[PDB]
Amino acid sequence: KIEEGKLVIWINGDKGYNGLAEVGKKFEKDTGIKVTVEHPDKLEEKFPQVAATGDGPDIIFWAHDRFGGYAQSGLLAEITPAAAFQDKLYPFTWDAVRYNGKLIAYPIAVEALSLIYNKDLLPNPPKTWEEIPALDKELKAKGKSALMFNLQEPYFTWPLIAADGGYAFKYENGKYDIKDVGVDNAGAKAGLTFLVDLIKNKHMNADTDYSIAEAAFNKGETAMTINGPWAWSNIDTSAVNYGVTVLPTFKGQPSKPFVGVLSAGINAASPNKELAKEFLENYLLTDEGLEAVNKDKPLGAVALKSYEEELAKDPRIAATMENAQKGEIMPNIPQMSAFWYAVRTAVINAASGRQTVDAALAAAQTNAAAMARFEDPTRRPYKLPDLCTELNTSLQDIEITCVYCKTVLELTEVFEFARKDLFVVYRDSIPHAACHKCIDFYSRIRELRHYSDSVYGDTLEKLTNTGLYNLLIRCLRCQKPLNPAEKLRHLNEKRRFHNIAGHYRGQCHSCCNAESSELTFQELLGERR
Amino acid sequence: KIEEGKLVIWINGDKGYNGLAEVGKKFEKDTGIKVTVEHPDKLEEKFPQVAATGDGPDIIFWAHDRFGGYAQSGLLAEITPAAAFQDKLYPFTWDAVRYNGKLIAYPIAVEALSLIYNKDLLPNPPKTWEEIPALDKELKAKGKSALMFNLQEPYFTWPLIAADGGYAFKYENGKYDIKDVGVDNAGAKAGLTFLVDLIKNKHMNADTDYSIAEAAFNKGETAMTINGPWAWSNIDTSAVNYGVTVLPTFKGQPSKPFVGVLSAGINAASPNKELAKEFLENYLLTDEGLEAVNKDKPLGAVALKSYEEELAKDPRIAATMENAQKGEIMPNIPQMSAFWYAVRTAVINAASGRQTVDAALAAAQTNAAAMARFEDPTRRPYKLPDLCTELNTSLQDIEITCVYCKTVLELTEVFEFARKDLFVVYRDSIPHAACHKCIDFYSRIRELRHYSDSVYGDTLEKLTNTGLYNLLIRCLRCQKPLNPAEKLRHLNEKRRFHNIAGHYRGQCHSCCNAESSELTFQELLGERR
Numbered sequence A, B: 001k002i003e004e005g006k007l008v009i010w011i012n013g014d015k016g017y018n019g020l021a022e023v024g025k026k027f028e029k030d031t032g033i034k035v036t037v038e039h040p041d042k043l044e045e046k047f048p049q050v051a052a053t054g055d056g057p058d059i060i061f062w063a064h065d066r067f068g069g070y071a072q073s074g075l076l077a078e079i080t081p082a083a084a085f086q087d088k089l090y091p092f093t094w095d096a097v098r099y100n101g102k103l104i105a106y107p108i109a110v111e112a113l114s115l116i117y118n119k120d121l122l123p124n125p126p127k128t129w130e131e132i133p134a135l136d137k138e139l140k141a142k143g144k145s146a147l148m149f150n151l152q153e154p155y156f157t158w159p160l161i162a163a164d165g166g167y168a169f170k171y172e173n174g175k176y177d178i179k180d181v182g183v184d185n186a187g188a189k190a191g192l193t194f195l196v197d198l199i200k201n202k203h204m205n206a207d208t209d210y211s212i213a214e215a216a217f218n219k220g221e222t223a224m225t226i227n228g229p230w231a232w233s234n235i236d237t238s239a240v241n242y243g244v245t246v247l248p249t250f251k252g253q254p255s256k257p258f259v260g261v262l263s264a265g266i267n268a269a270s271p272n273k274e275l276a277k278e279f280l281e282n283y284l285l286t287d288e289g290l291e292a293v294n295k296d297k298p299l300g301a302v303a304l305k306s307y308e309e310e311l312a313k314d315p316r317i318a319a320t321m322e323n324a325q326k327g328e329i330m331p332n333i334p335q336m337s338a339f340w341y342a343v344r345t346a347v348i349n350a351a352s353g354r355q356t357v358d359a360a361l362a363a364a365q366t367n368a369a370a371m372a373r374f375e376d377p378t379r380r381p382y383k384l385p386d387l388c389t390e391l392n393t394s395l396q397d398i399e400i401t402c403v404y405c406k407t408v409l410e411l412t413e414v415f416e417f418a419r420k421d422l423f424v425v426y427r428d429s430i431p432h433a434a435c436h437k438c439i440d441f442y443s444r445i446r447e448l449r450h451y452s453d454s455v456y457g458d459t460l461e462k463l464t465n466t467g468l469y470n471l472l473i474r475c476l477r478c479q480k481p482l483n484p485a486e487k488l489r490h491l492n493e494k495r496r497f498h499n500i501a502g503h504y505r506g507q508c509h510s511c512c513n514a515e516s517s518e519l520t521f522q523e524l525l526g527e528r529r
């Protein structure tokens, strides 16, 4: 579990964690309480896994969209700010961190993506996405490129995909209606097609990610990038002279970034909830607390009501709020992680020429719908191929982690899992399988600690009131169901079946197949021959 | 061990093993004895490892140079042919398979490398190595190359390296003498420099191997290759019209291929020695037996005296004997594998620009000398860095196999072995270490099967009559020697030291750091939640 009398804080690696650690230092000086700030990789996925086991940070920082799912799973303490403290922050920021009426996190700041441009290379940045190809040809001639931004996270491609998004029209027998089809609509496919065509025509590279696009822009190699307020401080220290402006329009529509409220939640398992509350309310959410973080990496527009007319004094924050107004606040429904995973796949499959845009966004909608069913134990798939089938994915491409060690199963291990007729297990509505090493290890442990009895094959037929032929018998070492030949080997070679943990187990063909071995070990240690 | 009443035969994968299996089929028809022919990868190294354990083939085929080492290790039965049978084969072929007076294999055929050339691309093949660069420029212009041959095995580069080889001159104080310096002489460095310059000037690629050079030649892409008689049949079936001629001269000296006598030895552990003898003498070493193999892949010049004046009827065999006469019969001293390993490294390091030619061939000589010392238990190195030091090799580059599983240790594992202060162990004068997986596994097995007693640290000081500070104590899980801090942790946390297999063991810092775990396994098997 978590250490009493100490605060552990997780926050994403692109935020001002160094400034946050200075707030923690001030907290220790004033109170004696030690604060440790960390930024684990993929912390938005690691938090519900470790918090489910009563472990993890005392405080987790993330955009508000993930917190609905955490709250639904019981992972967050209810937040109890006094009325006067609540009145310090914009009402809509509290609304972002409300879950079925209850406050589950403290809002910190409002973030949206903007267009960042090198003023020396591009005094007049383009107002439309459609200008960008021509501008890229001109800049290549000068040994530059027009635009580089992180294509790996759908957060960064969302603004363009969403720009012409819309409801779809429905029709039957002379009668028209309007229908919400999620991301499977013509406008979204239009924007995703435009992004793909940028890659097809070599205006962008599908492999570009955060650090590459950042390096390119801050070294003056590309004229434009797309990024949030946190990225300004690295550009500040670079020699680049940059501006921050409205994202380009697409088909005359504004780009529609998803707006995040950076928020701090308190682990439901923390024994330090009152300390966490004191830190968040009375040290971080002060002028000096937010300034220390913002000086490290800019927060965006802070949630404090006092700074409202100070916001537009900074043009970069005015541009942030302009893009924010043109986009939409992210939902915080518990299934937002399913939405994001489905869209991330659609965009990569599209930008890799794997799917058509239309098929990728149509699968995106139905995969998110299916993943939403992971909450229903009566309808969720418990076989790996059924999972694959319901997610429109080849076994060759599925990503699934071991329930024990959380590593992504390699392709060999995914095949074996399906081949051995094992069952998907759900932890907090996330499906898991198991890797080769964990199955083997816990096969061996299961063997010793749960050794009931042993019988010959003909005895087993009596105990089960079934013939050996169809009876499911798993190998005790690798869990593979024995085939009839392997059962026949048991009978002919007179090997028994062993009752391990309430069922009788056998050995497969493969698993079926020391005075000197130990004595070599002593030579390896130089003890004697 | 080996199966009585059956013959198992190993022969290299470039030989006529399909024809040899037809001889085995005829043997089964006439005698009832089943013959199985196999061609394991690296069989010349696998044979002494498995034959040391009373296992392996009944019969092993290889060039005679490896058989001295096998015989010295007791791996071969003495061969007992009658006087009249011996008179059937050339006396010098029997001499190749004599070991300290005793016959240890049956000779089959005489092999030497030749120059193979595409007559349509090159009616007049060059007589000298020095012509080859100019000829390669001319052929590149036509979209061809001059020469491609296996650069990975020093057998194929030996002819050129040896061409101007010589003894060196010695001098002191007005007095001159001649000295044998092995491969560390000016002529050998000259030839190895010429080969390297062919790679530097893009006349050959250092990565070229057997199958690449073969594919290139048999598809008409390169005008010349270097290969033995076994390679003729694949060229026969290709459309290439080819000739077989004398290797080119270097500095006016003939190329000097090493001449091999393909030979068949009988495993000292075989229970089928009389069957093996009957097969070899009376089925294989007949006109029809050798024809069946030779039709598959040509043998070269067979050892049967009867075919002497039939040899020169085939120009390819006349060219083989001409190159053989210009080269030398390989020695069969037990250390030939050390000679070959040292030269193989020298050539790769040279052709990769890693060493200079002079340093590579000078290290070759001294590494082979050092490896020869592996036979002396009083002088061989028992620490991995001492091994590295004596072989002029970085720990970063050493290749060493696990004594248990024979895998080559990966770089992580080589570092760990040295870091854990473990000892090189010698099996048949070959040095081994151990891989991470084998150490771990046999640490765990050692723990259970050899659990003497347990004591606290201050008790251990009494048992050893030494202070804890310098006392070597290994971690029972990873074998690392505990440092003083780790010993201090034992004392402060009151963990005891465990006597495993006659010495007290501890735990290292790293290794120091279930109703639900087992219950998840039942969901994975679908048995119940």
Ligand SMILES: OC[C@H]1O[C@H](O[C@H]2[C@H](O)[C@@H](O)[C@@H](O)O[C@@H]2CO)[C@H](O)[C@@H](O)[C@@H]1O
Pocket (backbone or CB within 6 Å): A012, A014, A044, A063, A064, A065, A066, A111, A153, A154, A155, A156, A228, A260, A340
């Ligand atoms: O791309 C999907 C990802 O987007 C959002 O994450 C943002 C985060 O809001 C920003 O603060 C910034 O750090 O970049 C992240 C994207 O790399 C969602 O908040 C998140 O749930 C979602 O996975």
Ligand SMILES: OC[C@H]1O[C@H](O[C@H]2[C@H](O)[C@@H](O)[C@@H](O)O[C@@H]2CO)[C@H](O)[C@@H](O)[C@@H]1O
Pocket (backbone or CB within 6 Å): B012, B014, B044, B063, B064, B065, B066, B111, B153, B154, B155, B156, B228, B260, B340
């Ligand atoms: O390259 C070192 C290697 O050379 C010889 O092996 C030859 C063998 O003699 C031929 O019959 C043919 O199969 O090609 C082999 C080279 O790849 C030595 O016989 C062997 O000991 C040595 O390792």
Ligand SMILES: [Zn+2]
Pocket (backbone or CB within 6 Å): A402, A403, A404, A405, A406, A407, A434, A435, A436, A437, A438, A439
């Ligand atoms: Zn695992």
Ligand SMILES: [Zn+2]
Pocket (backbone or CB within 6 Å): A475, A476, A477, A478, A479, A480, A507, A508, A509, A510, A511, A512
């Ligand atoms: Zn098995």
Ligand SMILES: [Zn+2]
Pocket (backbone or CB within 6 Å): B402, B403, B404, B405, B406, B407, B434, B435, B436, B437, B438, B439
């Ligand atoms: Zn091993």
Ligand SMILES: [Zn+2]
Pocket (backbone or CB within 6 Å): B475, B476, B477, B478, B479, B480, B507, B508, B509, B510, B511, B512
């Ligand atoms: Zn250890």
